[PDB]
Amino acid sequence: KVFGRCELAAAMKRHGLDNYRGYSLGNWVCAAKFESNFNTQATNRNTDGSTDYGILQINSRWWCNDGRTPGSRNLCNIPCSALLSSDITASVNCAKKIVSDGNGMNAWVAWRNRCKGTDVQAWIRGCRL
């Protein structure tokens, strides 16, 4: 499922991401845009073996189980395939555990590189929520 920008922003807000750990909505929307381009089905294979899943590109070595990444830790307790769902609850739920894991949003590389320090608010423009 490809979300629309403001449709994703609605959904994130519902789940509690607006200002969760101190990161306003627009930081989330921006992350999902550049990590996965709003596509739930997005998967990216890393040089180390592991794979990133879904709209928030959660990694298989430490958060979810794919059965194929050596040394995996599965801290969110869930199979990686449930993060490729068109409902985002499971990715949201694992993402609140990642953001509180001592690096803030810095865990997400495309957020770091495209969204940190920017005018993020800009990603809910035109949104009614």
UniProtKB/Swiss-Prot annotation:
| Catalytic residue positions | 35, 52
Q: Which domain of life is it from?
A: Eukaryota
Instruction: Tell me what reaction this enzyme catalyses.
Output: Hydrolysis of (1->4)-beta-linkages between N-acetylmuramic acid and N-acetyl-D-glucosamine residues in a peptidoglycan and between N-acetyl-D-glucosamine residues in chitodextrins
Intrachain disulfide bonds: 6-127, 30-115, 64-80, 76-94
One GO term (biological process): defense response to bacterium
Which key words tag this protein in UniProt? Answer: Allergen, Antimicrobial, Bacteriolytic enzyme, Disulfide bond, Glycosidase, Hydrolase, Secreted, Signal
Q: Where is the C-type lysozyme domain?
A: 1-129
Question: Got a GO cellular component term for this one?
Answer: endoplasmic reticulum
- Chain residues that bind substrate: 101
Cellular compartment(s): Secreted
- Decide whether keyword Cytoplasm is in the record: no
Which Pfam families does its entry note? Lys
Please list the GO terms describing molecular function. beta-N-acetylglucosaminidase activity; identical protein binding; lysozyme activity
Tissues expressing the protein: In the egg white and polymorphonuclear leukocytes.
Does the keyword section mention Ion transport?
no
- Physiological role: Lysozymes have primarily a bacteriolytic function; those in tissues and body fluids are associated with the monocyte-macrophage system and enhance the activity of immunoagents. Has bacteriolytic activity against M.luteus.
PANTHER family recorded: LYSOZYME C
Assembly and oligomerization: Monomer.
Q: What else is known?
A: Lysozyme C is capable of both hydrolysis and transglycosylation; it also shows a slight esterase activity. It acts rapidly on both peptide-substituted and unsubstituted peptidoglycan, and slowly on chitin oligosaccharides.
Q: Which family does it belong to?
A: Belongs to the glycosyl hydrolase 22 family.
State what protein this is by name.
Lysozyme C
Species in which this protein is naturally found? Gallus gallus (Chicken)
Gene expressing this chain = LYZ
